[PDB]
Amino acid sequence: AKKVKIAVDRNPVETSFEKWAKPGHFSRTLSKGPNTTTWIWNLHADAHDFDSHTSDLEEISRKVFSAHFGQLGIIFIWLSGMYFHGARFSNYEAWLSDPTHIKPSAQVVWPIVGQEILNGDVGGGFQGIQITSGFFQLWRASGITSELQLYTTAIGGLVMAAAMFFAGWFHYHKAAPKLEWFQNVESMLNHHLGGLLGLGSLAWAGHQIHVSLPVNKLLDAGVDPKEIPLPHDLLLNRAIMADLYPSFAKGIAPFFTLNWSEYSDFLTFKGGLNPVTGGLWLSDTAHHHVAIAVLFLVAGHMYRTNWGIGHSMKEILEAHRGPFTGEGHVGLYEILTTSWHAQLAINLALFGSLSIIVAHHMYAMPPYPYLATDYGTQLSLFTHHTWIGGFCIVGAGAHAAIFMVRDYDPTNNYNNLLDRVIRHRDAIISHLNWVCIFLGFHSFGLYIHNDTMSALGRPQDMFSDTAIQLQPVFAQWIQNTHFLAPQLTAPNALAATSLTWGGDLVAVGGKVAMMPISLGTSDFMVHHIHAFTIHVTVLILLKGVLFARSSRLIPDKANLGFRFPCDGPGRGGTCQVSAWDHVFLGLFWMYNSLSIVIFHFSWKMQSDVWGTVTASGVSHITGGNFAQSANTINGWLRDFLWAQSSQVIQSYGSALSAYGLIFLGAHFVWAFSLMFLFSGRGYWQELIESIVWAHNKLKVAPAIQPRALSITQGRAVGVAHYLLGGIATTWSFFLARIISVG
Amino acid sequence: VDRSKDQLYVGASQSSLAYLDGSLPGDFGFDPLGLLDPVNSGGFIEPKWLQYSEVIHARWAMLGAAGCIAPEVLGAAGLIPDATNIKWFESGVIPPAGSYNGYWADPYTIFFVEIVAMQFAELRRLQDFRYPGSMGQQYFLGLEAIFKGSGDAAYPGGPFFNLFNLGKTEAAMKELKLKEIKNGRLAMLAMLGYGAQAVMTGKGPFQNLVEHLADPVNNNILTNFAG
Amino acid sequence: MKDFTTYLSTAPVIATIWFTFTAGLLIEINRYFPDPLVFS
Amino acid sequence: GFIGSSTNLIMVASTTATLAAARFGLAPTVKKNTTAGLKLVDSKNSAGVISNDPAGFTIVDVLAMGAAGHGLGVGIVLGLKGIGAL
Ligand code: CLA
Ligand code: CLA
Ligand code: CLA
Ligand code: CLA
Ligand code: CLA
Ligand code: CLA
Ligand SMILES: CC1=C(/C=C/C(C)=C/C=C/C(C)=C/C=C/C=C(C)/C=C/C=C(C)/C=C/C2=C(C)CCCC2(C)C)C(C)(C)CCC1
Ligand code: SF4
């Protein structure tokens, strides 16, 4: 058995600026220099396609490992900037005193060409752009009270950024791991589960118990931020902590004697929300992170490394075989330890799915104080993390297909699961095709039915709560079960996990933090639109993966590569047969689906959750008009788009006028993209010929011959501008709307 | 780990015995994580740096273990005034834990002298490891004659670092290197003991010993969890 | 150093420097001569 | 008086049982993995830790069964309190 050990090569690559001055050095095709403008685009498209530059897996792995330190270095610079701008260009200290009546702001524009109008009167004796990232609420939760603490974190971030960039250089040019080091998947999982996640959660729980809880307890009691003891005083003076939490008078003895009930004063199971801040109890989060730490530290001892005990991941996979699936999971261990693309396909799929879960769980169970009543931050965070998840999921389809074309090998996959999936791909795709048509007719068709009946003056014939009803009874049943959990199935929980299940609302600063969310006919219809749009996106992406190597149309698609434009006008025309083109079409459908998801979230929250609380009751921002209007297309066009676009198109002359400009700018970029999507390069190349003639006539023709974009780049440019314009349009529309009425 | 002396300690493994041949001082075959394996080694994880670093830690720890308890012992014996009878963590190294005012300058003035003094001492020592014998070449007020080293970074020797030229024979020098490393490893663990006991108890190392002897059953780590 | 100064002469780097300079010149002119609509 | 109490007895019993079970071939050890059928079988150990114990009981077994015993004991101790028995 190979011993798990450190293994590197000394000084593999000399540190020199020689190759910086030789563009295209990394590739044998491009290293000879440009002859046409296509070279310039090719230089950038191939820069990070490491496996296309060499076949040595060790060389690829080292480039991946150091590229990751580069990414981490950039993230630390980004984080350091956020903390720095919070320390130097914000109203955080003023906000801490009056969180409800002050708008977070951490960007200040210089006065030039009249742009200082963008420094709005956000409160706290401060002028600047109102941020929606939620950093103020994160900083308060961690117990930060002064600009000095923010400033010190920013310095430390730069030190970490330098360390990351040093590590990247060091581990590529000085001590580069060997291929066998990377292939210790058992050891990597043990460290990333027990160490990265387990210790990280334990350490953060340590910060929460000793810093976050004491500081936030005094803040929620009305204590002034400057009179709260500094965090190190809490650490060094057990007496101060024992005043806040009496169990601290007993030290760590209850933990070691298994008298864990003593810590019930700061390790709780309350549930619900803190009625002062509108966020989760921090004593609940601290117990959460303690429990998570134990779970992951246990998980980190599962795999065998060097001492006999533990599991062989190869032995687990090979054991799980059944009558219906041939050889089963044989060969997957080899694939997953030799293909980065296979690993990236799985990791992107779940990381993206995880991001979407974060979006849902954070709106329903707001973990930060004063997050719930900052409607601008709530809408932004949900939208942001939904989009990241969608983009990541599409990347999973792309890199699964890349594995299919480049790394898949039939000799190692005979009658196993991967081989058997390929051999009934027509059955898989044909059925998924039918499901999409069924879902399309019976979900979007219901809206078309409703629009027609309403236009004909037959409202009694519509699918609606006051007419033919479509109640989501299954979702309604689940809500009731979760609302009653504390009584029977979660006896030790004081309250339900979320107020969306049912019960009483929580109001903070005269506004609704969270309240029960009712599910009617309109909610039934929109959920089956979501089912429809997701299934089609899967169809496009899955088809690209399963037919990446061949089809009945192109029997030898694998030899044509992952990314090619077509195989000619023959066979009736074969434009966009390649797997890359399926990712291209999948992006549009991913954009179409997640647009409706966030429109669903925006309208539902404004109509039925968010609002002001007074003696007369709760008045929602749009007055509960989602239920009766959201069941027609005209309802969405009128009551959502037309009505709620009032803020953005009326923002000129105010601090929000930048959103008005971007709103129009994004419409422009979107329409600009249709030029690339609708046309073909053959037209543009012929146009460039005439323009070249004019430059020749004047002796000003370039030496690098102008060329129209390649067919594939024309598509890449088209979708990139389509997405940027479409998303940036909704971005401006959301922020101008919510920062104004929120 | 097997204390005392043994042919091999508890953690010794057949894997570690491939490269741990006993030549190095203190080689008891204890390398469960295999950090001294020469094959495919690099960076700071290599036999020369790791062995050099252990000796360096051992020597600093031996000074620290004796220095972190000496003021309390001499203060108890009355050999020094009670004003200087202070716990090692209250001397000003950690001002939040307490500081001593009465030095001829503030600790930040003293610290600058430490930086300059240690930069010279440390960077010159580094150059002898990177370029053996290089510290005996360039002029250093005539002191370069004692900075030639010996080819082994951890044991420079010479007319000063080996002032009384002890360990003249190979067998004698080998015996002394073993004694240096075993006292050093004991001191390193003692320093770790001082740090943990300070956090656990808040008292000095000498008080902890006195109280444990007074009533061993009621004074120990198990009873120090509570208060 | 020759290679590094060669790297600084590549098109993207030259474009960055030149446009940073050109933008700085235009911004600074509008800082000292604000709101120019006509030539007088 | 923690020593001799119910919690102390359970923790000592659980850790002793796991150490005893592993040492006498009643639980998996460093030199004995388990198959899919829950049957002990000679394993392949990369490190090959040395032990003078007649049965080849290494320090890793002590750590493995010590941790397993503490998990078993802690679950029982907290479990019995949950139902009120302890
Ligand atoms: C000053 C130190 C230094 C020097 C002289 C070199 C030199 C070299 N490196 Mg090394 N390297 C360094 C630092 C250095 N490296 C660091 C810090 C890392 C960790 C990230 C690496 C990681 C690394 C890898 C993984 C590889 C090299 C390679 C190379 C060779 C080609 C470099 C090249 O073409 O760069 C020109 C490239 C650039 C200028 C791109 C810079 C990208 C960085 C991350 C900054 C991007 C930030 C930017 C803001 C991104 C957003 C842009 C947006 C705002 C528009 C060459 C021998 C390559 C090779 O072939 O080696 C044999 C190779 O594969 N290096
Ligand atoms: C990783 C997370 C973490 C960390 C770092 C801490 C840290 C701390 N906790 Mg907390 N705690 C945590 C998680 C954590 N806790 C969790 C999850 C819980 C819930 C069960 C608690 C519950 C809890 C309670 C109830 C109490 C603490 C207390 C403490 C403090 C004293 C601990 C103690 O007695 O240590 C004992 C000894 C050690 C930890 C060993 C220290 C070893 C040192 C660093 C060695 C240094 C050696 C080196 C050679 C020195 C060189 C010196 C140089 C100048 C030369 C300490 C600040 C106590 C306190 O007073 O809080 C204010 C306290 O009453 N904690
Ligand atoms: C962890 C994430 C991750 C990683 C490490 C990679 C890595 C890789 N991908 Mg994959 N990919 C990902 C996510 C990821 N991908 C996602 C989320 C998607 C879905 C969109 C894809 C879709 C995808 C495709 C379709 C392809 C790859 C390809 C590649 C390879 C070459 C990349 C390259 O050279 O880019 C060079 C980088 C550029 C040319 C810059 C692109 C910038 C975009 C177009 C616009 C950015 C706009 C910006 C965010 C906002 C506006 C700024 C502006 C106003 C200034 C490389 C192995 C290529 C390949 O062939 O692999 C074998 C390939 O064809 N990826
Ligand atoms: C509004 C624009 C629009 C419409 C209506 C469609 C419609 C469709 N697309 Mg397309 N698509 C669009 C834009 C649109 N697309 C764009 C812009 C792109 C480029 C990115 C694509 C790219 C694309 C791909 C790549 C795929 C689709 C797919 C589909 C089908 C999904 C299954 C379905 O719902 O079938 C049912 C049809 C509908 C829901 C449309 C409306 C049906 C009406 C309401 C029925 C009326 C019936 C009535 C009796 C009419 C009588 C008329 C007269 C004879 C009297 C469907 C035919 C997928 C597919 O084929 O899946 C099998 C697929 O793979 N589309
Ligand atoms: C993804 C992160 C990562 C990974 C997987 C590795 C992996 C590796 N590194 Mg690299 N390294 C990294 C990040 C990483 N490095 C960074 C960020 C830096 C810059 C500081 C370096 C600098 C670096 C150097 C200079 C060297 C390595 C070496 C190594 C190898 C041995 C590591 C070892 O012995 O660790 C085991 C750990 C130790 C021996 C002790 C580390 C103690 C640290 C400094 C403190 C504790 C850190 C902890 C995570 C957080 C503490 C929090 C709080 C309690 C204070 C191995 C291939 C060595 C090598 O090439 O060997 C052939 C080597 O010489 N790395
Ligand atoms: C590296 C280890 C180390 C370090 C960093 C310290 C650090 C400290 N010790 Mg500790 N100590 C150590 C080891 C160490 N000690 C050891 C091993 C012992 C046991 C012998 C002691 C015994 C000890 C005692 C008894 C006391 C300290 C004290 C101190 C503190 C004040 C130091 C001072 O005043 O120096 C003063 C400076 C010097 C001694 C060096 C003189 C420098 C001049 C410029 C040289 C002039 C040379 C010239 C040619 C004249 C030579 C004359 C000669 C031939 C007669 C300080 C926190 C004191 C304390 O805690 O006070 C509150 C204290 O009372 N230490
Ligand atoms: C017979 C004999 C002997 C003896 C021995 C002994 C006496 C032993 C002991 C041993 C022991 C006595 C051990 C122990 C161990 C322990 C451990 C290793 C522990 C662990 C733990 C853990 C891991 C925990 C965890 C946790 C936490 C922390 C929290 C909560 C949760 C849990 C519980 C999970 C000798 C060798 C002398 C000689 C020969 C014969
Ligand atoms: S139109 Fe373009 S993509 Fe389609 S077959 Fe012709 S050349 Fe290929």
Curated annotation (Swiss-Prot), chain A:
Cellular location(s): Plastid, Chloroplast thylakoid membrane
Record-listed [4Fe-4S] cluster binding positions: 566, 575
Binding annotation for phylloquinone: 684
Positions of chlorophyll a binding: 675, 683
Alphabetical GO biological process terms: photosynthesis
GO molecular function terms listed in the Swiss-Prot or TrEMBL record: 4 iron, 4 sulfur cluster binding; chlorophyll binding; electron transfer activity; magnesium ion binding; oxidoreductase activity
Binding site for chlorophyll a': 667
Coiled coil region boundaries: none
GO CC annotation, single: photosystem I
Domain of life: Eukaryota
Xref: PANTHER family: OUTER MEMBRANE PROTEIN, OMPA-RELATED (PTHR30128), PHOTOSYSTEM I P700 CHLOROPHYLL A APOPROTEIN A1-RELATED (PTHR30128:SF19)
Family under the similarity heading: Belongs to the PsaA/PsaB family.
Name of the molecule in the record: Photosystem I P700 chlorophyll a apoprotein A1
Taxonomic lineage: Eukaryota, Viridiplantae, Chlorophyta, core chlorophytes, Chlorophyceae
Designated gene of the protein: psaA
From Swiss-Prot, chain C:
Keyword Transmembrane helix: yes
Keyword Membrane: yes
Keywords linked to the UniProt accession: Chloroplast, Membrane, Photosynthesis, Photosystem I, Plastid, Thylakoid, Transmembrane, Transmembrane helix
SUPFAM superfamilies on file: Subunit IX of photosystem I reaction centre, PsaJ
GO BP terms in the entry: photosynthesis
UniProt family annotation: Belongs to the PsaJ family.
PANTHER family: PHOTOSYSTEM I REACTION CENTER SUBUNIT IX, PTHR36082
Identification of the protein by name: Photosystem I reaction center subunit IX
From Swiss-Prot, chain D:
Superkingdom of origin organism: Eukaryota
Segments passing through the bilayer: 2-22, 59-80
GO annotation terms (biological process): photosynthesis
Gene Ontology CC, one term: photosystem I
Membrane topology: Multi-pass membrane protein
Recorded family membership: Belongs to the PsaG/PsaK family.
Protein name: Photosystem I reaction center subunit psaK, chloroplastic
Gene that this sequence comes from: PSAK
Residues of the full protein shown: 28 to 113 of 113
